[PDB]
Amino acid sequence: MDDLVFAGNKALYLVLILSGWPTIVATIIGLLVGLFQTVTQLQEQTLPFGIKLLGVCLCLFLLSGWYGEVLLSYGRQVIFLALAKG
Amino acid sequence: MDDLVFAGNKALYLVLILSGWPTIVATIIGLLVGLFQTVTQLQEQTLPFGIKLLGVCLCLFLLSGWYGEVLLSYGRQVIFLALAKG
Amino acid sequence: DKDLLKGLDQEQANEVIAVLQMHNIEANKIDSGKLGYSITVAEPDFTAAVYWIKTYQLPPRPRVEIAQMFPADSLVSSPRAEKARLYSAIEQRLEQSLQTMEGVLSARVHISYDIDAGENGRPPKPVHLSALAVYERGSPLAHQISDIKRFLKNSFADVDYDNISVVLSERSDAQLQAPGTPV
Amino acid sequence: DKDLLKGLDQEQANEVIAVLQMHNIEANKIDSGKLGYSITVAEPDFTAAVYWIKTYQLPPRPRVEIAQMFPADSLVSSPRAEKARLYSAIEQRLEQSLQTMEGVLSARVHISYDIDAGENGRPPKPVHLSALAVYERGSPLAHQISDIKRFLKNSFADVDYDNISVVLSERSDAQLQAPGTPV
Amino acid sequence: DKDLLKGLDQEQANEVIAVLQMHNIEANKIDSGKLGYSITVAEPDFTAAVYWIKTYQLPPRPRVEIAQMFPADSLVSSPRAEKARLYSAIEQRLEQSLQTMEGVLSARVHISYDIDAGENGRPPKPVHLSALAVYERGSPLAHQISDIKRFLKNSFADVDYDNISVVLSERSDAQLQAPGTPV
Amino acid sequence: DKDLLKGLDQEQANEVIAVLQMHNIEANKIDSGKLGYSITVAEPDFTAAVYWIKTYQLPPRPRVEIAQMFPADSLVSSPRAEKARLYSAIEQRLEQSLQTMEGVLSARVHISYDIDAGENGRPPKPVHLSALAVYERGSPLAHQISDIKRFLKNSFADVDYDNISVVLSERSDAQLQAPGTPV
Numbered sequence: 018m019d020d021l022v023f024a025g026n027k028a029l030y031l032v033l034i035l036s037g038w039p040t041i042v043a044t045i046i047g048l049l050v051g052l053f054q055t056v057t058q059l060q061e062q063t064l065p066f067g068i069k070l071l072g073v074c075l076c077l078f079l080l081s082g083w084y085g086e087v088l089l090s091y092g093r094q095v096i097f098l099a100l101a102k103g
Numbered sequence: 104m105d106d107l108v109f110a111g112n113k114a115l116y117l118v119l120i121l122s123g124w125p126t127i128v129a130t131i132i133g134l135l136v137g138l139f140q141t142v143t144q145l146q147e148q149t150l151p152f153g154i155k156l157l158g159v160c161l162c163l164f165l166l167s168g169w170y171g172e173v174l175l176s177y178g179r180q181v182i183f184l185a186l187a188k189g
Numbered sequence: 190d191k192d193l194l195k196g197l198d199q200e201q202a203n204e205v206i207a208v209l210q211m212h213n214i215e216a217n218k219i220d221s222g223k224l225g226y227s228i229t230v231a232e233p234d235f236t237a238a239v240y241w242i243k244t245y246q247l248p249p250r251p252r253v254e255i256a257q258m259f260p261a262d263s264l265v266s267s268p269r270a271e272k273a274r275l276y277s278a279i280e281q282r283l284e285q286s287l288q289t290m291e292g293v294l295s296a297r298v299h300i301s302y303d304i305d306a307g308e309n310g311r312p313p314k315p316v317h318l319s320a321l322a323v324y325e326r327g328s329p330l331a332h333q334i335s336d337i338k339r340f341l342k343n344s345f346a347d348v349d350y351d352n353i354s355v356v357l358s359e360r361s362d363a364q365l366q367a368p369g370t371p372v
Numbered sequence: 373d374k375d376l377l378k379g380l381d382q383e384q385a386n387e388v389i390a391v392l393q394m395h396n397i398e399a400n401k402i403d404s405g406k407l408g409y410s411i412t413v414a415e416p417d418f419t420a421a422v423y424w425i426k427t428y429q430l431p432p433r434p435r436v437e438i439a440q441m442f443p444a445d446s447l448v449s450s451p452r453a454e455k456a457r458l459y460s461a462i463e464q465r466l467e468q469s470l471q472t473m474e475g476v477l478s479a480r481v482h483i484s485y486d487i488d489a490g491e492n493g494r495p496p497k498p499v500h501l502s503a504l505a506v507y508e509r510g511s512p513l514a515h516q517i518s519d520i521k522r523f524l525k526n527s528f529a530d531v532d533y534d535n536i537s538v539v540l541s542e543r544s545d546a547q548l549q550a551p552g553t554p555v
Numbered sequence: 556d557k558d559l560l561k562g563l564d565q566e567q568a569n570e571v572i573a574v575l576q577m578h579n580i581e582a583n584k585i586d587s588g589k590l591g592y593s594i595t596v597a598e599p600d601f602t603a604a605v606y607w608i609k610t611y612q613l614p615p616r617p618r619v620e621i622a623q624m625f626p627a628d629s630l631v632s633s634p635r636a637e638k639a640r641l642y643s644a645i646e647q648r649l650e651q652s653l654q655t656m657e658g659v660l661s662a663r664v665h666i667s668y669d670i671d672a673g674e675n676g677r678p679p680k681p682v683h684l685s686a687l688a689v690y691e692r693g694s695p696l697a698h699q700i701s702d703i704k705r706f707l708k709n710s711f712a713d714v715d716y717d718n719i720s721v722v723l724s725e726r727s728d729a730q731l732q733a734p735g736t737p738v
Numbered sequence: 739d740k741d742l743l744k745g746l747d748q749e750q751a752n753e754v755i756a757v758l759q760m761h762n763i764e765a766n767k768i769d770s771g772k773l774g775y776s777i778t779v780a781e782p783d784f785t786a787a788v789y790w791i792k793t794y795q796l797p798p799r800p801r802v803e804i805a806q807m808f809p810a811d812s813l814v815s816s817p818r819a820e821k822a823r824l825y826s827a828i829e830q831r832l833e834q835s836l837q838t839m840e841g842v843l844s845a846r847v848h849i850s851y852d853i854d855a856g857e858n859g860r861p862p863k864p865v866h867l868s869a870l871a872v873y874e875r876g877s878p879l880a881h882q883i884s885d886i887k888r889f890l891k892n893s894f895a896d897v898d899y900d901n902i903s904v905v906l907s908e909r910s911d912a913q914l915q916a917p918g919t920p921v
C-alpha cells in the first residue's frame with residue numbers, strides 16, 4: 018500500500034520538477050517584453066512568441082541530460098517495487 | 104548513445120531555424136508598421152496584418168527550395184542510421 | 190614579544206594556551222575585540238612554541254556534524270536528506286545523555302548511516318554503533334563497559350551486543366603547577 | 373635581509389618557519405596586515421633557504437575536501453552529489469573522533485566512494501577503509517592497531533577486518549634549542 | 556646587469572633562482588609590485604644562464620588539475636563532468652595524505668578514469684593506480700614499497716596488488732654553499 | 739646594427755638568443771615595453787644570422803594543446819568534445835608528473851584519441867601511448883626504459899607493454915663560454 022501511495026506521489030513530484038524551469042523562463046520573458054512595450058509604446062504581439070521560442074529551446078538543450086537520468090532511475094525503481102516481492 | 108543524441112538534438116535545432124525566419128520577418132514588419140502609426144498618430148487594426156501576409160508569402164517564395172534540401176537530407180540520414188546495423 | 194597567532198576564537202585560544210602550558214611554555218592572551226585574541230610568547234620559547242603548533246596542527250578546526258550539509262533551508266528535501274538530519278540529531282542527543290552517567294567526563298558516538306542507499310527499492314539493513322568515553326582516575330573500566338552496552342542496545346529497534354563497539358580511557362595527570370619564567 | 377615570500381597567511385607562515393628552523397636557518401616573520409605575512413632571512417642563509425623551499429614545495433596548498441566540488445547552492449542536486457556530500461562529511465567526523473583517543477596526535481581517514489556508480493541496476497558493493505596516524509614516543513604500535521580496527525568496524529553497515537588498512541608512525545625528535553645566528 | 560625575465564610570480568622566481576644557483580650562477584631578484592619579479596645576472600654569466608633557461612624550459616607552467624576543465628561554477632553539469640570532478644578530487648586527497656607518512660617529502664598519484672566510457676549497459680572495468688614518491692636520504696626504499704601498496708589497496712572497492720605501480724627515489728645532494736661572485 | 743626581429747615575446751626572444759649564441763653570433767636584446775623585444779646583431783654577422791633564422795624557422799610558434807579546440811565555455815557540447823577535453827588534460831598531467839622522475843629534464847606524452855569514433859554498439863579499442871624524454875649525461879638509458887613503462891602501464895584501464903613506445907635522448911654539450919666580438 019504505502020509503496021503505491023509513495024510511487025503515485027513521486028509521479029506528480031517529478032512532473033512538477035521537470036516542467037518547472039521552462040514555464041519559469043516563459044513567464045519572465047512574458048513579463049519583461051510586456052513591460053518594455055509599455056515603456057516604449059509599441060503594440061506588437063508576436064514579439065513575445067518570437068523571443069520565448071528561443072528561450073524555451075535553449076533550456077531544453079541545457080537540461081537534455083538530467084531529464085534522461087531522472088526518468089531512467091524512476092523507471093528502474095518502480096519496476097523493482099512492482100516485481101520484487103517475496 | 105551518440106546516434107540517438109545526434110538525431111534528437113538535430114531535430115530541435117532544425118525546428119528552431121526553419122521556424123525562425125518567417126517569425127523574424129513578421130516581427131520586424133510588425134514593429135515598423137506599429138511605429139509609423141505612432142509618428143502619424145493614425146490608427147487601424149488591419150494595416151499590419153495586410154502587410155505581414157505579403158511579407159511571409161515572399162519569405163516562403165524565396166527560401167522554400169532550401170527547406171526541401173534540408174528536409175531531404177535529414178530524411179535520408181535518419182533512415183540510414185536506423186538500418187545502419189545491417 | 191613575538192606573535193604566534195591572531196584573530197583566534199575564545200575556544201581556540203584556551204586550547205592553545207592549554208597545550209603550551211603543558212610543555213612549560215608561558216604564554217599570554219590578549220583581546221582586541223572585533224579582531225579577536227592574540228597569543229604571544231618570549232623569544233627563548235619561540236622555537237619550541239612553533240614546533241608544538243606544528244605538531245598539534247593548532248588552532249583547532251570547528252566541530253563537524255552531518256546536519257550542516259543539509260541545511261533544511263531547501264525548497265523541498267528528498268527522503269535521503271530528511272533521514273540524514275534525523276540520524277544526526279539522534280547522535281548528538283545520545284552523546285549528551287552519556288555525559289550524565291557516573292564519572293564520565295566526555296564521549297563520542299557514531300551510527301551507521303543506512304541512508305547511503307535509502308529509497309532504491311531495497312529493504313533496510315541492521316544498525317551498528319560505536320562509542321568512545323573518558324573516565325575519572327581509578328574507575329573499573331571493565332565493569333563499566335557493561336552498563337554502556339546495556340544502555341545503548343535498547344535505544345534502537347534492532348541492535349546486537351555483537352554490533353556495539355566501546356572504547357574507554359582514563360584521564361591524564363593533572364596540570365596544577367605553573368610554568369617557570371625564562372631567566 | 374632578502375625577501376623569500378610575501379602575502380602568506382598565518383598557517384603558511386608558521387609552516388615555513390617550522391621547516392626552516394629545523395635546518396638551523398634563523399628566519400623572521402613580518403606582518404603587513406591587508407598584505408599578509410612576509411618571511412626574511414640573512415644573506416649567508418639565503419641559498420640554503422631557497423633550496424629547502426624548493427625541496428619541500430612550500431608554501432603548502434590549502435587542504436582538500438570532496439564537498440568542495442559539489443556546492444549546495446547549485447540549481448540542481450542529483451543523488452550522486454548528495455551521496456558525495458554525505459561521505460565527505462562522515463570522513464571528517466571520523467578523523468575528528470580519532471584525534472581524541474589516548475596518545476594520538478593526528479590522523480587521516482579514507483573511505484571507498486561507491487557513488488561513482490549510481491547504485492542503480494547493480495547492487496551495492498562492500499565498503500573499504502584506510503587510516504593513517506601518529507603516536508607519542510614509546511607507544512606499542514602493534515598492540516594499538518587492534519583498538520582502531522575494532523572502533524572502525526562497527527561504524528558502517530558492512531566492513532570486514534580484512535578490508536581495513538591501518539598505518540602508524542611515531543613522532544620525530546623534538547626541536548627545542550634555537551638556531552645559531554650567522555657570524 | 557642584463558634582464559632575463561620580467562613579470563614573474565613568486566613561485567616561478569624562486570624556481571628559477573634555485574636552478575641557477577645550483578650551476579654556480581649568482582642571480583638577483585627584484586620586486587616591481589603589480590609588475591611582478593625580475594631576475595638579473597652579470598654579463599660573464601649571461602650566456603650560461605640563457606643556455607640553462609632553455610634547457611630546463613623555465614619558467615614553469617601552472618600545475619594542471621582535471622577539475623579545471625569541468626568547472627563546478629557553471630549552469631549545468633553533465634554526468635560525465637560530475638563523475639570527473641569526483642575522481643579529480645580523490646587524487647588530490649590521496650597525494651595530500653601520502654605527504655604525511657614518515658620520511659616522505661612529496662608524491663604524485665594517478666587513477667584510471669573509467670569515466671572515459673559511461674559503461675551504461677556495460678560492466679565497469681577494475682581500477683588501476685600509479686604513484687611516485689621522493690624520500691629522505693638513508694631510507695630503505697625496498698622495505699617501504701610494501702606500506703604504500705597496503706595503504707592504497709583499501710582506498711578503492713576493488714584493487715589488486717598487481718594493478719598498483721610504485722616508483723621511489725631519493726633526495727639529491729644539498730646545495731648549502733653560496734656561489735662565487737665573478738671577479 | 740641591423741634589425742632582425744621586432745615585437746617578440748619574452749620566451750621567443752630567449753630562444754632566438756640561445757640559437758644565435760650557439761653558432762658564435764653575439765646578439766643584443768632590447769625592451770620597448772608595449773612594443774615587445776627587439777634583437778640586433780653586427781653587420782659582419784648579419785648574413786649568418788639570417789641563414790640560421792631561416793634554417794630553424796625562428797621565432798617559434800606557441801605550444802598547441804587540444805583543449806584549445808574545444809573551449810569549456812561554448813553554449814553546448816556533444817559528448818565528443820567533453821571526452822576530448824578529458825584526454826587533453828590527462829596528457830598534460832602525465833607530462834608534469836614524469837618531469838619529477840630522477841634526472842629527467844623534459845618529456846612529451848601522446849595518447850591515442852579513440853574519441854574520433856563512438857565505439858557505440860561496439861567494442862571500444864584499447865589505448866596506445868607514446869613518450870619522449872631527455873636525460874642528464876651519464877644515465878643508463880637501457881635500465882631506465884623499464885621504469886617509465888612500468889609507471890605508464892597502470893595509468894589506464896587496459897594497456898599492454900607492447901602498446902607503449904618510449905624514446906630517450908641525452909643532453910647536448912653545455913654552452914658555457916661566451917662568443918667572440920667581431921674585430
Ligand SMILES: CCCCCCCCCCCC[N+](C)(C)[O-]
Pocket residue numbers: 077078080081084111112115
Ligand atoms: C515544442 C517542444 C516540446 C518538447 C517537449 C519534450 C521536451 C524534451 C525533449 C527531449 C530532450 C531535449 N532534447 C534537446 C534532446 O531534445
Ligand SMILES: CCCCCCCCCCCC[N+](C)(C)[O-]
Pocket residue numbers: 084085086088089104107
Ligand atoms: C519528456 C521527458 C524528457 C525527455 C527524455 C525522455 C527519456 C529519453 C530516454 C533517455 C535515455 C538516456 N540515455 C541516452 C542516457 O540513455
Ligand SMILES: CCCCCCCCCCCC[N+](C)(C)[O-]
Pocket residue numbers: 081082085107108111112114115118
Ligand atoms: C522535436 C521535439 C521532439 C524531439 C524528441 C527527441 C527525443 C530525444 C530522446 C533522447 C533524449 C536524451 N538524450 C539526449 C540523452 O538522449
Ligand SMILES: CCCCCCCCCCCC[N+](C)(C)[O-]
Pocket residue numbers: 163164165167168170
Ligand atoms: C500560410 C501558408 C503556410 C504554409 C507553411 C509551409 C511553408 C513551406 C512549404 C510550402 C512552400 C511553398 N512554396 C514556396 C514552394 O511555394
Ligand SMILES: CCCCCCCCCCCC[N+](C)(C)[O-]
Pocket residue numbers: 167168169170171172
Ligand atoms: C498554400 C500552402 C501550400 C503549402 C504546401 C505546398 C506544397 C509543398 C511545396 C512543394 C514544393 C517544394 N519545393 C519548393 C522544395 O519544391
